[PDB]
């Protein structure tokens, strides 16, 4: 069984959250630091180097705060 | 143990109906048009349950009724078409850009099912009623501050391959826009819908037939 609410933010408070989500509170899936209007860096996703001053969103920007 | 199977399925059927209601609200153009953005990922699942997985939104447009049929009776969720870059099975036929009056997705295509199959990335017209999730993640797509375009098969391959890589880096799943905290759906009845689903699920998992 898969809850339709499993990917929404209140699932973080479910008592089974840490037993069901491998990364727990560190999970990127439940991170509150993703800017929804900035594209993720395609150089990073491609294995190429960012240009100097790259202003895309990077994986280090979205790693959770708690 | 036979009246108890009845309670189990009654709970599952209440949950199924409330889920359909919740999905309709999230698919409603008043709530989602602002978030149908080129590069954002969309989970496409069709009317019959066929799961196309995650794709990349390329374009969005108001569906126009035919000549023939000025009032076709489309719901609001059926009144808009999202062009999504999806991964089709290698044996999927050519993609008909033009959806007819009664179609949610073109005919003759399907997701990759056979494990060997690498698939083929194509832009597929999908109704908003096929949107079963939106991601906070956006990928870079060719606008013309660049060049390139998804008419180019190699651009489609590259973007699709970066979609596979973003999925690999999200171990626990592509992050979903939360309908309250990211889409700002503030409706009082919508909060009630989510709470009722939660209460029923608590009852479902406490039932011994749940495993
Ligand atoms: Zn970069």
Same domain, residue pair A3 and A26: yes
Same domain, residue pair A4 and A21: yes
Answer for the pair B71, B91: CB distance below 8 angstroms, yes or no: no
Q: List Cα–Cα distances, A41 to A50, A54, B161, in angstroms.
A: 8, 8, 14
Q: List Cα–Cα distances, B48 to A41, B16, B37, B44, B51, in angstroms.
A: 35, 15, 26, 12, 9
Pairing of strands B51-62, B120-127: unpaired
The size of the A-B interface in CB pairs under 8 A is 82
* Number of neighbouring beta carbons within 10 Å of residue B112: 18
What is the C-alpha to C-alpha distance for residues B152 and B140, in angstroms, rounded to an integer? Answer: 15
Q: Which of B12, B200, B172, B170 is nearest to A19 (CA)?
A: B172
Same domain, residue pair A22 and A50: no
Q: List Cα–Cα distances, B87 to A8, B120, B121, in angstroms.
A: 25, 5, 5
Chain-chain contact of A4 with B175 (C-beta, under 8 angstroms):
no
What is the C-alpha to C-alpha distance for residues B68 and B180, in angstroms, rounded to an integer? Answer: 40
Structure tokens belonging to residue B63: 């569906």
Same domain, residue pair A26 and A41: no
Number of domains, chain A: 2
Q: List Cα–Cα distances, A24 to A11, A27, A38, A52, in angstroms.
A: 11, 5, 25, 34
Same domain, residue pair A42 and A66: yes
Same domain, residue pair A26 and A39: no
Answer for the pair B36, B58: CB distance below 8 angstroms, yes or no: no
State the structure-solving technique: X-ray
Strand order in the sheet with B120-127: B120-127, B80-88, B51-62, B40-45, B131-138
**Environment class of B180 (CB within 10 Å of its CB; exposed 0-12, middle 13-18, buried 19+):** middle
- The torsion defined by the Cα of B180, B183, B188 and B190, in degrees rounded to 10, comes to -80
Nearest chain B residue to A59 by CA distance is B169
Same domain, residue pair A46 and A22: no
Distance A45 CA to ligand 1 centre (A): 9
Distance A60 CA to ligand 1 centre (A): 11
What is the C-alpha to C-alpha distance for residues B27 and B45, in angstroms, rounded to an integer? Answer: 12
What is the C-alpha to C-alpha distance for residues B57 and B54, in angstroms, rounded to an integer? Answer: 10
What is the C-alpha to C-alpha distance for residues A12 and A6, in angstroms, rounded to an integer? Answer: 9
Q: What string of DSSP letters covers A1-66?
A: ---TTTTSGGGGGSTTHHHHSTTGGG-GGG-S---TTSPBPHHHHHTPPPPTT--SB-HHHHS---
3-state secondary structure of B195: helix
What is the C-alpha to C-alpha distance for residues B210 and B205, in angstroms, rounded to an integer? Answer: 6
**Environment class of B107 (CB within 10 Å of its CB; exposed 0-12, middle 13-18, buried 19+):** exposed
Answer for the pair B55, B163: CB distance below 8 angstroms, yes or no: yes
Same domain, residue pair A39 and A66: yes
3-state secondary structure of B183: coil
Question: Which residue has 């126009």 as its token pair?
Answer: B64
Structure tokens belonging to residue B184: 């700002």
Residue B127 has phi, psi (to 5 degrees) of: -75, 155
Same domain, residue pair A58 and A39: yes
Question: Which residue has 């590069």 as its token pair?
Answer: B39
What is the C-alpha to C-alpha distance for residues B156 and B148, in angstroms, rounded to an integer? Answer: 10
* Domains of chain B, CATH where assigned: 1-35+179-211 (1.20.1500.20), 36-177 (2.40.30.300)
Answer for the pair B125, B60: CB distance below 8 angstroms, yes or no: no
Q: Cβ contacts (< 8 Å) between A23 and chain B: which residues? A: 171-172
Domain around A18: 1-30
DSSP B76: G
Nearest chain B residue to A7 by CA distance is B176
**Resolution rounded to one decimal, in angstroms:** 2.0
- Residues facing residue B55 across a β-bridge: B42
């Amino acid at each position: 069984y898969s809850s339709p609410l499993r990917f929404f933010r209140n699932f973080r408070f479910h008592p089974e959250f840490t037993r069901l989500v491998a990364g727990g509170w560190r999970s990127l899936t439940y991170s509150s630091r993703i800017d929804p209007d900035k594209e993720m860096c395609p150089y990073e996703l491609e294995g190429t180097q960012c240009p100097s001053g790259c202003s895309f969103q990077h994986f280090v920007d979205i790693t959770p705060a708690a | 143990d036979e009246a108890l199977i009845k309670d189990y399925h009654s709970i599952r059927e209440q949950i199924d109906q409330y889920t359909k209601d919740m999905v309709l609200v999230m698919q409603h153009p008043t709530n989602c048009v602002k978030y149908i953005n080129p590069g954002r990922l969309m989970h496409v699942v069709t009317s019959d349950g066929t799961d196309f997985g995650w794709g990349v939104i390329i374009n969005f447009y108001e569906r126009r009724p035919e000549r023939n049929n000025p009032n076709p009776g489309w719901s609001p969720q059926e009144s808009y078409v999202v062009e999504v870059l999806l991964r089709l099975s290698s044996d999927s036929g050519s993609v008909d850009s033009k959806l007819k009056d009664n179609q949610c997705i073109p005919a003759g295509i399907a997701p990759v099912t056979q494990k060997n199959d690498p698939g083929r990335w194509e832009v597929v017209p999908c109704l908003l009623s096929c949107m079963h999730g939106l991601s906070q993640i956006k990928l870079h797509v060719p606008d013309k501050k660049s060049g390139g375009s998804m008419d180019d098969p190699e651009t489609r391959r590259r973007v699709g391959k970066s979609l596979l890589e973003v999925q690999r880096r999200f171990e626990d799943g592509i992050p979903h826009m939360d309908p309250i905290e990211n889409m700002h759906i503030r409706d009082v009845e919508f909060k009630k819908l989510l709470r009722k689903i939660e209460v029923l699920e608590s009852r479902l998992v406490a039932n011994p037939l749940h495993n």
